Design a binder for this molecule. Sequence first.
Ligand SMILES: OC[C@H]1O[C@@](CO)(O[C@H]2O[C@H](CO)[C@@H](O)[C@H](O)[C@H]2O)[C@@H](O)[C@@H]1O
Ligand SMILES: [Mg+2]
Lengths: 554, 416
Amino acid sequence: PISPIETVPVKLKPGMDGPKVKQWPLTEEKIKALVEICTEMEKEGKISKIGPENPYNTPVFAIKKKDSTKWRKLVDFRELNKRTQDFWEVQLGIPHPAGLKKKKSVTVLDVGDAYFSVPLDEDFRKYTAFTIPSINNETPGIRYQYNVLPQGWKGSPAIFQSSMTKILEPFKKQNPDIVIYQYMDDLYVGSDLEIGQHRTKIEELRQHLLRWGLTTPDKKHQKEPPFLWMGYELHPDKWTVQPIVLPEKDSWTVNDIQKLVGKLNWASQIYPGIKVRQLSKLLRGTKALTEVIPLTEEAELELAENREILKEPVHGVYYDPSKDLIAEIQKQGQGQWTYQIYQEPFKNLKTGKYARMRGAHTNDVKQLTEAVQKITTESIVIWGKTPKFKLPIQKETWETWWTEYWQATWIPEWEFVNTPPLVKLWYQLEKEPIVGAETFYVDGAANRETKLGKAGYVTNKGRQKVVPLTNTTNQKTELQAIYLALQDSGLEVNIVTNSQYALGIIQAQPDKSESELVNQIIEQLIKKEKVYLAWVPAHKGIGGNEQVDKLVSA
Amino acid sequence: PIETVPVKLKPGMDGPKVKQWPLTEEKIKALVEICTEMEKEGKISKIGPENPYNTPVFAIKKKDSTKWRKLVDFRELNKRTQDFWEVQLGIPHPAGLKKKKSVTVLDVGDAYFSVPLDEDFRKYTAFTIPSINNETPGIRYQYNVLPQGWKGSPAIFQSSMTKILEPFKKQNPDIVIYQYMDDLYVGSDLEIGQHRTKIEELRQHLLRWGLTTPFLWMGYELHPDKWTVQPIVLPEKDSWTVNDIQKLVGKLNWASQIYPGIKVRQLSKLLRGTKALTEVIPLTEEAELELAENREILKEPVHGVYYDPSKDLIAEIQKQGQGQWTYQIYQEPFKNLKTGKYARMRGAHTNDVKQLTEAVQKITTESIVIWGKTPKFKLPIQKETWETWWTEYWQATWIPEWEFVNTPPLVKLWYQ
Ligand SMILES: OC[C@H]1O[C@@](CO)(O[C@H]2O[C@H](CO)[C@@H](O)[C@H](O)[C@H]2O)[C@@H](O)[C@@H]1O
Ligand SMILES: [Mg+2]
């Protein structure tokens, strides 16, 4: 006698009725294999037949299970899901084997027919109705309604996932010597008991589940390592991801690259040194999923370097709370970064990457800060604590940066590791004007309509320049003006602009930019020995600003 | 047997649907323990996924406190909850609290758990406790009593509050009491020792209702009579350079948006040529007075700036370096109600976030005391950096609204 699982009350959204969709056209092979499935569902108690007083129905179809002769039944509840109440999903994340502690005894077993072992709410079953053609819509076919959580319904996951937790609640509390990771119907069970007592507890658990109607077939019952779990292979002292198949096709479509980049993301969690910059650049644009893209010389060198890494099989280790967490980061160029998290040298818990190019202007320090913040959040999720950081940036470099930057920023306890390429600042603007350096008053101007402009400067020594410009904007001219002053000055220079825009960029000390004009200014700023930028309000009749504004405007 | 006070959301607004953010090991344990005890005592009850609402929850330690304190981020729920001033349960604000020599802040949130919460409103208080490495799905609860940090708790509970303080108020008519969220603000003009005694009196007085019917023993001292403002200042130099006058002009040009009478004509005259920044140029007869007359205008108060209770408060903060931090509070731009400067706070010279957090707490405290409102902050920080560290340093029982900005300092306007 099975114990009944208390139903979860479910509603539709306010002012909405049930679903009313006519059956899709259905080929003979599909119409015939289904009628075999429906009668069996009525047998085990999963479905009831009566329909005439039920105006609702949802479409149904069937696709072959992955390379199997079997036919799978699916219901297009997309219309019901719109009309069904919103749920709060209790699955907040995915477990990671790097967060597992080593255990002496382990088991992995699944629940057979997860969704169909939990009863649906009595009042909501009517809306799950559906209709199946008899023999090509010649006769009036069979109707049905679900009595359990159906596949394709947006509520089925969250509901079962929560019900499974209530059933486990008493067992976990009366067996604190056990650890149970539950992900949907998959159960990982570990302990430091003698395997006899482990197999015992697993049977107590195995029966405790059956008491509420949850079977645990022996097919899905893993007893001997390695344990297949969440896409990983769990050996006693090491874990590893299941094999990774990279497409080896010579003619690359968009989707093939998307598929390619996707696997390298998944691969980056254990295989150190993965890059995906140049491969992702190939996808930039409105390129359809069918367009063949020729791999650039940089993308071919990166895809080759990634295969070099995946040739050798890599394994990660398990967590030891007695030890600190170490996270070490390395720069790999082109706004890419890789990191390894470990407690013992050369025995990584896991690895990862960070290649985000956020913004038009950036520098390595900003990015390093962002990689620390990504690694931190990832560490809190898996281990509940922040790791010690080993960064390729010197204390003096970092101290200069955050003390002078105008936004708040910080890095947790960290130490320097001399692993080139180190992160550094490529130039530093002077805080006060430079005695003896020529003073350039710069400005620029462009015609909003004709898009023609001018850029130039005037100096205290009588130096002047003005340049005509085509297909430009006020912003670009104001930058070009600064660039001219930097080219035409000595190693030390003062500069005065009324461009709030140009100053906001430079003062952040970018080392890379999507604007070549900005990159050129950067290249110049690195060559100088002392630079002093200064801002003045426009059209206030000040100094050389008044003069140069007339040159570039009129 | 306490009848519930009904509650509604603002017409045409769903409940809060906010994701829970990752929590550290030490913080999950505190909540699991705290929520196990609240469930036993019936103050909360477990729920399922059929409840579509959720609010974030973490734990904090008030200043100089070693035990954890459950803190719910009811900012979303508070904005979607009915305004209780229209219900006349709104708490009036005393204009004399900011004039007292001493003010103690007492956490009376523990009292709100004695009052039930309207059954039809409990589903809006749903929250989830996460687990390390996602060992377990979310464990969801919802409140059956007035929750801490919800703007309706002090409103519904005020009627019971004024009762408890009736004898204390009648014995001590000079003391001022003000309630904001889970906090009680008590201020008097007594000597320090005499003040702290009247607070312990108020405490035991609360025990006399605790026996009758985080913890109450903690108290934090303020001194509003000692609060000063940070005005705009023009430097006093005996010799000026082209650069000094160029910065001065820009600053005076910006300041004119606040003070209408500022003028820069006679000073601009000194910048007629095309000179080197380091050149020293003297001040003309007309310029010295123009500078002095501008200094005078920055002494007297701005015209037509006053507090409007119907308008939200905004607060901006600027990082000045060397552990210095300036801020301004306003309702309409350029009509600042207060300006200040903080320095040598915790975190100085090593942690920007800890300093900025302390500053937000400092500023919010001053807005509660002065106007009875928390301002929305314009924080000088990158979003991802703030959302990674700010909970590691929060020590208050309330959480203000905030937005992020990036405004490079072209004019050192509030500092020199
Ligand atoms: O901080 C913004 C960030 O937080 C979230 C979730 O916590 O929203 C919070 O921040 C807002 C600004 O104060 C609050 O108004 C909001 O109610 C609060 O939940 C996210 O929406 C957002 O990414
Ligand atoms: Mg101009």
